[PDB]
Design an enzyme around this catalytic site. Structure first.
Site, PDB file in Angstrom:
ATOM      1  CB  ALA A   1     114.932  56.033 -72.128  1.00  0.00           C
TER       2      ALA A   1
ATOM      3  CD  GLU B   1     120.611  84.036 -73.778  1.00  0.00           C
ATOM      4  OE1 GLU B   1     121.699  83.855 -73.193  1.00  0.00           O
ATOM      5  OE2 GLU B   1     120.528  84.537 -74.921  1.00  0.00           O
TER       6      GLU B   1
ATOM      7  CB  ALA C   1     109.741  51.537 -61.444  1.00  0.00           C
TER       8      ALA C   1
HETATM    9  N1  GTP Z   1     115.370  56.816 -77.702  1.00  0.00           N
HETATM   10  C1  GTP Z   1     115.480  55.834 -76.813  1.00  0.00           C
HETATM   11  N2  GTP Z   1     114.365  55.399 -76.128  1.00  0.00           N
HETATM   12  C2  GTP Z   1     114.469  54.399 -75.220  1.00  0.00           C
HETATM   13  C3  GTP Z   1     115.696  53.802 -74.970  1.00  0.00           C
HETATM   14  N3  GTP Z   1     115.511  52.847 -74.030  1.00  0.00           N
HETATM   15  C4  GTP Z   1     114.204  52.829 -73.683  1.00  0.00           C
HETATM   16  N4  GTP Z   1     113.544  53.778 -74.420  1.00  0.00           N
HETATM   17  C5  GTP Z   1     112.111  54.109 -74.341  1.00  0.00           C
HETATM   18  O1  GTP Z   1     111.758  54.177 -72.973  1.00  0.00           O
HETATM   19  C6  GTP Z   1     110.485  53.611 -72.741  1.00  0.00           C
HETATM   20  C7  GTP Z   1     110.523  52.721 -71.504  1.00  0.00           C
HETATM   21  O2  GTP Z   1     111.183  53.390 -70.453  1.00  0.00           O
HETATM   22  P1  GTP Z   1     112.547  52.837 -69.801  1.00  0.00           P
HETATM   23  O3  GTP Z   1     113.548  53.962 -69.691  1.00  0.00           O
HETATM   24  O4  GTP Z   1     113.110  51.692 -70.609  1.00  0.00           O
HETATM   25  O5  GTP Z   1     112.102  52.327 -68.337  1.00  0.00           O
HETATM   26  P2  GTP Z   1     112.931  52.762 -67.025  1.00  0.00           P
HETATM   27  O6  GTP Z   1     113.067  54.266 -67.003  1.00  0.00           O
HETATM   28  O7  GTP Z   1     114.288  52.102 -66.971  1.00  0.00           O
HETATM   29  O8  GTP Z   1     112.024  52.318 -65.769  1.00  0.00           O
HETATM   30  P3  GTP Z   1     111.603  50.786 -65.500  1.00  0.00           P
HETATM   31  O9  GTP Z   1     110.145  50.602 -65.843  1.00  0.00           O
HETATM   32  O10 GTP Z   1     111.802  50.471 -64.039  1.00  0.00           O
HETATM   33  O11 GTP Z   1     112.453  49.869 -66.344  1.00  0.00           O
HETATM   34  C8  GTP Z   1     110.120  52.817 -73.981  1.00  0.00           C
HETATM   35  O12 GTP Z   1     108.940  53.352 -74.526  1.00  0.00           O
HETATM   36  C9  GTP Z   1     111.243  53.030 -74.969  1.00  0.00           C
HETATM   37  O13 GTP Z   1     110.700  53.462 -76.194  1.00  0.00           O
HETATM   38  C10 GTP Z   1     116.822  54.233 -75.656  1.00  0.00           C
HETATM   39  O14 GTP Z   1     117.915  53.711 -75.443  1.00  0.00           O
HETATM   40  N5  GTP Z   1     116.708  55.252 -76.578  1.00  0.00           N
END
Ligand code: GTP
Ligand code: GDP
Ligand code: QRQ
Ligand code: MG
Lengths: 155, 436, 431
Positions: free
Chosen positions: B12, B254, B99
């Site tokens: 994300a 700020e 993870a």
């Molecule tokens: N807005 C938005 N949310 C995202 C995106 N990709 C994943 N998410 C959200 O992130 C959550 C899952 O976390 P991730 O970031 O995919 O997992 P990670 O941080 O890579 O960690 P791991 O568990 O090791 O894969 C989910 O609930 C998704 O809704 C994105 O590209 N845009």
């Protein structure tokens, strides 16, 4: 031993040893520690020849071990169909009860021996017989989801 | 200059950083390869956009960004995409084993195998600065890496940068998008361990962005690319004052002064308007009063709550485009009069206004139409505690039967932290209740 | 993570295991010689998960074939894809197991378990980022149950940070060769609850009733049963082998599907149910794929899910279909069947789509569920086990191999506890 040898010969299926030991005056109704006769072990390990031979020479077809198991219980449990009918032909108690309340119909139903179940019903197996928990053979068929057995028990 | 380093953790965080830095280049007139023909300063430079971009001797502008993930799938696309030449290749750091949606793996067992490399690469960018003011951290709440590694990273940054600021851009989970089952757990754990290490955290509810993409953009099943382009449009509005000349939130310090009254209730609510579908290119242009009114409607919020049910502690308005200041004051006069926007009695009831007279940029390939004027309201209201209550509730439903706890205990984490993190949230709920 | 080391033990493990390879090789575009002749780039993106890339476009399965008798050795080679396995990965003993779990776990299997670990250790060194192990075996025999569970424990202690995954087929009197199968199955469950992370319960009782009552095959064979097994194994590994845009691996499945370390026995389902060559399934829809997937007649474990509550559910849809219609039909089921999912696990149902459908089908669905109704499978095994054990029948076959009587009472007790936990979480409320 000659009693212990006939017990082990009836378990291992030594046909000639059973005939030889019986010739030397071996006890056909001998018992082991738990009360198993040569007829129990022959019906348990599926030796149909030894079953008929023992029944021809004074074997108690309705003898019970320490737990109340008759030869018909064990034959219905393991699934030897011909031994079941030979036992029934020589007057086996089709509704005998062991220490767990199980009847020959119970054991054949739990192990899914459908043909043996049908034979026991033809010979008057009590369909209302309950085990120590109150379950009949039809109760067991409903609890395990055995549709094939439930249709058989309702013929 | 007063440089800013952006850190992106997890899928994300990385994918959102992609859309943000893509949009940043379009606002500053920067090509994918890093060349900028406009401002003709040879090297280094000293304009306001240099807080986010460093300058090489060959005229290349490299973002001050670090992309970290415990698995290479997402970052490898940045290494081969349109902006493969833009970022520092050594600031795209990947592992081999993610993870697995487990906070404990991200923070303890798996995160420890790369944390020292990430800090050494951050130190490399930090030493390229004459006056670093802090970090902008992009991550998710529910992800294993985005929650575990981010909390681990924020704890280490406070030791190595005690006086520097740290701002969060966090993704609040939502059943519509995707999410794992243990996402309530990861969200509560990372909030407990990062609360003391963050000055200002902007929550972005995925359900809020999801509903805007369907209602305002007419998108049936919004993809991650649809959600991120809309979120990056809002991140750009929050960080615009850092990259251009302004008088409101000119530096990371700020933000805490204008938005964070107390260092624990530091979760401002963001509201963006207007959101117009690109298929409606010949739309009537909304007035300054109309887009300002739209900031107090629930549909335009980034976190699903009801500010009418709570009290305000601070409120900043960040306009972009053809926005005359006299029309802002008239709009605020109408908001204060007719609407019941209750403030707490111990804070100045005045609205802080910052105007960037550049038209809002939209990315070619996006779902947004060009607008003459946009506005992002940053407000610190107690109503956002409802979002914590929704997370606390799902946490309590599972933890009451210790569901999924063994996955966390078996990765170098004690079960007591579950009770610590939950009680810390119950204290955060109490803080919002006693404020107003 | 990527690579998966596949192991198949016993006659049943190699039979359904060989079926698994000739199915996914057909889906990925591999021939019995190991060459690639498919017509899609998506068939090769995540191909390292099950195959090794040898010399000149020669994809070899990362499979290890185990059995305690050389009979099944030549049967796998003579099969359609028997020549694609690495000949060095065949570890077959001489004297068989004879349906004796103790012979596979203590005597004949112990003399061969070291020779197998050397093959597993080699296949693990050629892995970039190994994620876990996958096992196919039956619980009713002696090799796949006895030696299979011994192989699990040896790997669990040598690769403890990896996911142990099994495809365990349950014995049934409908398809039974001996009445000691409840013995062998119970002794294996005692090993599976403590050493595996995910177990797919492929009950032979369910496969038979599907072929007998639903598919109307009056005398089902092993080919009919294994046809359902291959269709299920292909579905449950779809997200592992094809790209999509979700992140799918064995640990993220276990973390999301297993709320309690011992309750990791999944109930698999598949729709539509087809026999070998019939061309009957022609017009199926999304409202029908969703209905059949949760219908008890499409379960590969003979247990009615409406007798318990779902803890976690993962659904796979394959083929060109409306993703909009999938989300609304899945939402439709979670509403009318609200009391069949535990409410103390919010959002415990996961949906997924995949463009590539299985062979012979244009649309399909695969159901994976962690339901408390799986206790009916263990209660059925326990009642048969208890019936045999209380008469001490055939017990000398096992105690003769150094096995103690207490090992049976513990296996009986431990499986009763397993049923107790399912009933415990079946009646638990939020309040
Ligand atoms: N807005 C938005 N949310 C995202 C995106 N990709 C994943 N998410 C959200 O992130 C959550 C899952 O976390 P991730 O970031 O995919 O997992 P990670 O941080 O890579 O960690 P791991 O568990 O090791 O894969 C989910 O609930 C998704 O809704 C994105 O590209 N845009
Ligand atoms: N579904 C299926 N079940 C099988 C197959 N072969 C054997 N079984 C079952 O497995 C049990 C026998 O175990 P088996 O694998 O033959 O013994 P092993 O060689 O010692 O592992 C019996 O209950 C059979 O019903 C098969 O090809 N397909
Ligand atoms: C949806 O199908 C799959 C999902 C995952 C993992 C993610 C999950 N998230 C949830 C969320 C709720 C409930 C269950 C799950 S499983 C892995 C799979 O194969 C390895 C897979 O294909 C079967
Ligand atoms: Mg990730």
């Amino acid at each position: 031993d000659l009693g212990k040898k006939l017990l082990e010969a009836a378990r291992a299926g030594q046909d000639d040893e059973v005939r030889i030991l019986m010739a030397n005056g071996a006890d056909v109704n001998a018992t082991d520690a738990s009360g198993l006769t040569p007829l129990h072990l022959a019906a348990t390990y599926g030796h149909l020849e030894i079953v008929e031979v023992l029944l021809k020479h004074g074997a108690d077809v309705n003898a019970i071990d320490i737990m109340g198991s008759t030869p018909l219980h064990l034959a219905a449990l393991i699934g030897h169909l011909e031994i079941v009918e030979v036992l029934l032909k020589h007057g086996a108690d089709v509704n005998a009860v062991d220490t767990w309340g199980d009847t020959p119909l119970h054991l054949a139903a739990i192990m899914g021996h459908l043909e043996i179940v049908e034979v026991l019903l033809k010979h008057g197996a009590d369909v209302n017989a309950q085990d120590k928990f109150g379950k009949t053979a039809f109760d067991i068929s409903i609890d395990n989801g055995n549709e094939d057995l439930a249709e058989i028990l309702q013929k | 200059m007063r440089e800013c380093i952006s850190i992106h953790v997890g899928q994300a965080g990385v994918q959102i950083g992609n859309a943000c830095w893509e949009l940043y280049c379009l606002e500053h007139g920067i090509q994918p390869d890093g060349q900028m023909p406009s401002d003709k300063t040879i090297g280094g430079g000293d304009d306001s956009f240099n807080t986010f971009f460093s300058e090489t001797g060959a005229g290349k502008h490299v973002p001050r960004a670090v992309f970290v993930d415990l698995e290479p799938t997402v970052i490898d696309e940045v290494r081969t995409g349109t902006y493969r030449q833009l970022f520092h290749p050594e600031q795209l750091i990947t592992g081999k084993e993610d993870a697995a949606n487990n906070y404990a793996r991200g923070h303890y067992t798996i995160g420890k195998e790369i944390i020292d490399l990430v800090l050494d690469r951050i130190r490399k960018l930090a030493d390229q600065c004459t006056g670093l003011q802090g970090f902008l951290v992009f991550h998710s709440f529910g992800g294993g890496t985005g929650s575990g590694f981010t909390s681990l990273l924020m704890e280490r940054l406070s030791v190595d940068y005690g006086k520097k600021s740290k701002l969060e851009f966090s993704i609040y989970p939502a059943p519509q998008v995707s999410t794992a089952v243990v996402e309530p757990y990861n969200s509560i754990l990372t909030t407990h361990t990062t609360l003391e290490h963050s000055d200002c955290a902007f929550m972005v509810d995925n359900e809020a962005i999801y509903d805007i993409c369907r209602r305002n953009l007419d998108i049936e099943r919004p993809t991650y690319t649809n959600l991120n382009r809309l979120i990056s449009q809002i991140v750009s509005s929050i960080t615009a004052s850092l990259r251009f000349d302004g008088a409101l939130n000119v530096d990371l310090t700020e933000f805490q002064t204008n938005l964070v009254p107390y260092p624990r209730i530091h979760f401002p609510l963001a509201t963006y308007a207007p959101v117009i579908s690109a298929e409606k290119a010949y739309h009537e242009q909304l007035s300054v009063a109309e887009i300002t009114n739209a900031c107090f409607e629930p549909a335009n919020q980034m976190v699903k709550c009801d500010p009418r049910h709570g009290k305000y502690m601070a409120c900043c308005l960040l306009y972009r485009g053809d926005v005359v200041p006299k029309d802002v004051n008239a709009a605020i006069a109408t908001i204060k009069t007719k609407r019941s926007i209750q403030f707490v009695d111990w804070c100045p009831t005045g609205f802080k206004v910052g105007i960037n007279y550049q038209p809002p940029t939209v990315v070619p390939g996006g779902d947004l139409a060009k607008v003459q004027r946009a506005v992002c309201m940053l407000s610190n209201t107690t109503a956002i505690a409802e979002a914590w209550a929704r997370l606390d509730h799902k946490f309590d439903l599972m933890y009451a039967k210790r569901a999924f706890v063994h996955w966390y205990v078996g990765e170098g984490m004690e079960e007591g932290e579950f009770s610590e993190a939950r009680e810390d949230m119950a204290a955060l709920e109490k803080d919002y209740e006693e404020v107003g | 993570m990527r690579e998966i080391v596949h192991i198949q033990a016993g006659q049943c493990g190699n039979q359904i295991g060989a079926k698994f390879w000739e199915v996914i090789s057909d889906e990925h575009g591999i021939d019995p010689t190991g060459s690639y002749h498919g017509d899609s780039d998506l068939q090769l993106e995540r191909i390292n998960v099950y195959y090794n890339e040898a010399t000149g476009n020669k994809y070899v399965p990362r499979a290890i074939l185990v059995d305690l008798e050389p009979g099944t050795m030549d049967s796998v080679r003579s099969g359609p894809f028997g020549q694609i396995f690495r000949p060095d990965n065949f570890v077959f003993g001489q004297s068989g197991a004879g349906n004796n779990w103790a012979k596979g776990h203590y005597t004949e299997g112990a003399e061969l378990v070291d020779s197998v670990l050397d093959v597993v250790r080699k296949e693990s060194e050629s892995c970039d980022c190994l994620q876990g192990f996958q096992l196919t075996h039956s619980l009713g025999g002696g090799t796949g149950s006895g030696m299979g569970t011994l192989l699990i424990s040896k790997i669990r202690e040598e690769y403890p940070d990896r996911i142990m995954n099994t495809f365990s087929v349950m014995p049934s009197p409908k398809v039974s060769d001996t009445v000691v199968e409840p013995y062998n199955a119970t002794l294996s469950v005692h090993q599976l609850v403590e050493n595996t992370d995910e177990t797919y319960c492929i009950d032979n009782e369910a496969l038979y009733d599907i072929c007998f009552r639903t598919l109307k095959l009056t005398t089902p064979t092993y080919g009919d049963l294994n046809h359902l097994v291959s269709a299920t194994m292909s579905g449950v590994t779809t997200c592992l082998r094809f790209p999509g845009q979700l992140n799918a691996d064995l640990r993220k499945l276990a973390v999301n599907m297993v709320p309690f370390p011992r309750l990791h026995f999944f109930m698999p389902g598949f729709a539509p149910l087809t026999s070998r060559g019939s061309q009957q399934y022609r017009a199926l829809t999304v409202p029908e794929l969703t209905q059949q997937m949760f219908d008890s007649k499409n379960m590969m474990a003979a247990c009615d899910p409406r007798h318990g509550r779902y803890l976690t559910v993962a659904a796979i849809f394959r083929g060109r279909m409306s993703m909009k219609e999938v989300d609304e039909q899945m939402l439709n089921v979670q509403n009318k069947n609200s009391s069949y999912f535990v409410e103390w696990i919010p959002n415990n149902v996961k949906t997924a789509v995949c463009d590539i459908p299985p062979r012979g089908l244009k649309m399909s669905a695969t159901f994976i569920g962690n339901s408390t109704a799986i206790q009916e499978l263990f209660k059925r095994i326990s009642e048969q086990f208890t019936a045999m054990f209380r008469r001490k029948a055939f017990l000398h076959w096992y105690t003769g191999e150094g096995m103690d009587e207490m090992e049976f009472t513990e296996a009986e007790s431990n499986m009763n506890d397993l049923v107790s936990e399912y009933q415990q979480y079946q009646d638990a409320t939020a309040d």
